[PDB]
Amino acid sequence: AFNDLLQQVGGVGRFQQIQVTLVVLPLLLMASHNTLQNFTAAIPTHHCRPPADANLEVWLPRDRQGQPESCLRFTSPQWGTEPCTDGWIYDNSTFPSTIVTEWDLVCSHRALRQLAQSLYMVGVLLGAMVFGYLADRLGRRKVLILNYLQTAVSGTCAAFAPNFPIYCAFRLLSGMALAGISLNCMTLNVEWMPIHTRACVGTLIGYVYSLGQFLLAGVAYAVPHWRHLQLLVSAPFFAFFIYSWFFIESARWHSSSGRLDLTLRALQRVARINGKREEGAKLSMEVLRASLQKELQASAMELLRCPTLRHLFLCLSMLWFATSFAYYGLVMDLQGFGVSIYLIQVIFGAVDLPAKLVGFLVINSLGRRPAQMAALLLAGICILLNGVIPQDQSIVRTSLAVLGKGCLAASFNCIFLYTGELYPTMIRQTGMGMGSTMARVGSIVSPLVSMTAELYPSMPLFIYGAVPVAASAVTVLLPETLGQPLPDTVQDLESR
Numbered sequence: 328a329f330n331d332l333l334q335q336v337g338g339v340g341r342f343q344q345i346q347v348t349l350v351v352l353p354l355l356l357m358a359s360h361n362t363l364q365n366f367t368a369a370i371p372t373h374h375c376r377p378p379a380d381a382n383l384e385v386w387l388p389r390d391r392q393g394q395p396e397s398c399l400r401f402t403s404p405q406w407g408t409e410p411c412t413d414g415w416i417y418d419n420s421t422f423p424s425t426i427v428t429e430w431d432l433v434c435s436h437r438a439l440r441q442l443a444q445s446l447y448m449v450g451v452l453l454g455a456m457v458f459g460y461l462a463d464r465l466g467r468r469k470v471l472i473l474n475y476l477q478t479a480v481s482g483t484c485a486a487f488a489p490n491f492p493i494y495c496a497f498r499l500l501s502g503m504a505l506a507g508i509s510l511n512c513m514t515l516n517v518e519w520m521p522i523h524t525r526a527c528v529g530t531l532i533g534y535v536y537s538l539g540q541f542l543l544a545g546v547a548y549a550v551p552h553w554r555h556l557q558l559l560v561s562a563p564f565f566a567f568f569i570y571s572w573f574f575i576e577s578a579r580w581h582s583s584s585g586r587l588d589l590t591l592r593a594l595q596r597v598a599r600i601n602g603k604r605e606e607g608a609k610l611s612m613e614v615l616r617a618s619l620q621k622e623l624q625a626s627a628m629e630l631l632r633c634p635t636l637r638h639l640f641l642c643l644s645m646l647w648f649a650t651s652f653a654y655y656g657l658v659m660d661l662q663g664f665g666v667s668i669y670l671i672q673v674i675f676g677a678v679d680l681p682a683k684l685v686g687f688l689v690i691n692s693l694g695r696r697p698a699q700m701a702a703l704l705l706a707g708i709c710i711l712l713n714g715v716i717p718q719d720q721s722i723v724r725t726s727l728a729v730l731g732k733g734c735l736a737a738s739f740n741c742i743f744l745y746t747g748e749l750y751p752t753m754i755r756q757t758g759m760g761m762g763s764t765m766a767r768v769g770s771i772v773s774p775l776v777s778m779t780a781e782l783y784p785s786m787p788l789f790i791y792g793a794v795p796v797a798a799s800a801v802t803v804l805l806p807e808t809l810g811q812p813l814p815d816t817v818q819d820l821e822s823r
């Protein structure tokens with residue numbers, strides 16, 4: 328019954344305004360880190376370095392396009408092919424330095440650029456799990472303080488990485504910390520705020536991430552060099568670590584632990600901050616106990632064990648994997664469209680704003696399932712048509728990728744509501760975590776799929792498209808939730 332107490336000590340008041348602003352400010356740089364490698368790893372045009380002894384036309388084989396071939400140089404001077412031992416010359420017009428230029432992650436080692444994104448995301452999957460356990464054991468706040476320090480240290484050390492294995496290690500650790508920031512952000516804010524506003528928070532947090540995409544575009548234009556851009560995007564988290572010491576730990580986590588002494592201390596401190604001091608003094612242990620006694624979940628396995636909840640698990644896992652796998656596939660590949668990588672990031676960021684509305688409108692009106700078939704099928708049709716339409720077309724390809732990314736942003740928003748209303752109260756938090764875990768598996772698998780570009784230039788896109796088209800067909804199986812009350816038991820779910 329914490330909700331009741333939550334409204335005695337000011338409800339939303341100075342403490343919630345101050346702390347929530349501060350706890351959601353870091354998220355503005357989650358987008359900057361997740362998709363940083365579009366700018367820190369951009370691939371400049373590379374052609375082989377002519378042999379040093381020789382004093383480009385004569386030393387470079389030309390492809391059909393008539394541009395110098397990237398991975399080959401002539402063995403002997405041809406007037407009017409060996410792999411390149413002497414290195415590559417990279418165009419410096421757009422990208423002064425990138426991890427690709429620094430470590431020659433080009434030609435045979437091209438897959439390494441994507442391995443690094445996959446490793447960062449392996450870190451994000453690991454961090455959601457490690458830090459989720461650690462938060463329940465050490466506190467939402469203590470785990471946040473340590474996560475701000477880890478992102479700052481790991482990201483700074485990645486910027487000063489001397490070799491590629493080390494950059495990848497510090498990028499996995501950066502992601503582990505960031506996964507814990509994104510989780511503990513929600514928990515600390517949601518638990519210190521009213522229950523009814525469990526979605527507005529899910530929204531401000533959602534839009535604060537989208538604004539992060541414009542932040543990456545503006546920051547990357549200003550600081551093109553990768554070591555400098557990685558340092559700039561990670562140095563803010565040392566400042567976050569310094570003020571995070573003044574956060575107030577969730578009183579709800581304190582009550583759950585068994586320490587009502589700290590629930591009382593937090594509630595009184597907040598009453599001083601919100602200005603309702605008299606009302607806080609009234610709060611004692613005879614009151615807090617009785618009014619928090621009723622409050623005082625099922626194992627994840629159950630999702631698999633019950634046939635009813637296994638069907639809802641499998642179906643939703645395909646929906647969460649597909650949306651993430653496709654979304655990262657599209658968001659990762661900003662260079663191919665033929666427009667500046669900065670304008671495309673700004674555009675891609677913008678779409679999320681009219682998308683989320685159009686989504687809200689179709690979801691609250693038509694249904695929660697028709698919106699998921701439409702958001703995923705249309706994204707799949709757009710991505711597969713980006714694959715088929717010839718590159719020459721930049722506007723037709725850019726417009727279709729932009730619509731597709733907007734549709735996958737809508738799918739993210741719907742799959743959150745859809746997944747919280749489909750599950751019964753007992754397994755609803757486990758189920759939203761498993762769904763988010765499958766989303767993170769999608770992000771790990773997506774860069775690995777992109778490595779198939781070598782096999783065929785359009786194979787990466789044909790998969791990033793076919794998977795959402797298949798997920799859309801899976802939504803047919805799931806049950807409509809519009810106008811139906813949330814289920815409380817498996818039987819309840821079965822009934823409706």
Ligand SMILES: CCCN(CCC)S(=O)(=O)c1ccc(C(=O)O)cc1
Nearest residue numbers: 361451536651736739763766767770
């Ligand atoms: C909670 C898991 C989802 N994630 C992907 C897995 C790492 S995420 O990076 O947090 C993300 C991505 C995209 C959008 C959006 O466009 O709405 C919001 C959040």
